[PDB]
Amino acid sequence: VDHYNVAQDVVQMLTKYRELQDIIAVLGIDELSEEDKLIVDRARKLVKFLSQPFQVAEVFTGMTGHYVQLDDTIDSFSGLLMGTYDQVPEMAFYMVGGINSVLEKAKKMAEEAAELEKMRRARV
């Protein structure tokens, strides 16, 4: 049941995002309701999350592949819908496996950002 409910919720989110994308392209992302901005952000993360590096495309991707167990797929997406990962950067979900990989990539991005901020601050 948990698998079914999560899948339907993801589809509903993506369906709504597609409809909102029509408005976004013409006018702009900043001409939307504040509620719809949250949906857009979650949908974009979902789209990025759906991507996965395959073990057969280590040449075209340049990255090690992943095998995601179904139980991790359900848990990772279910948490994302709840919004517990809103703070995570959008790109952290791109070309990764389970939620754990997302967090690890976010940590590395945060460390790099902190290093850049330190370099900028030290420049003063």
């Binding site: 703070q87 754990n100 976010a106 902190a114």
Partner: peptide
């Protein structure tokens, strides 16, 4: 008060999430 008398995989996700949130907060400070 009477409650006082008588009375791990998910933890890793929580631990990682806390660390990332801490880093994102630290960078903001300075």
């Amino acid at each position: 008060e009477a409650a006082e008398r008588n009375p791990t995989g998910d933890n890793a996700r929580d631990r990682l999430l806390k660390e990332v949130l801490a880093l994102q907060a630290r960078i903001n400070q300075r």
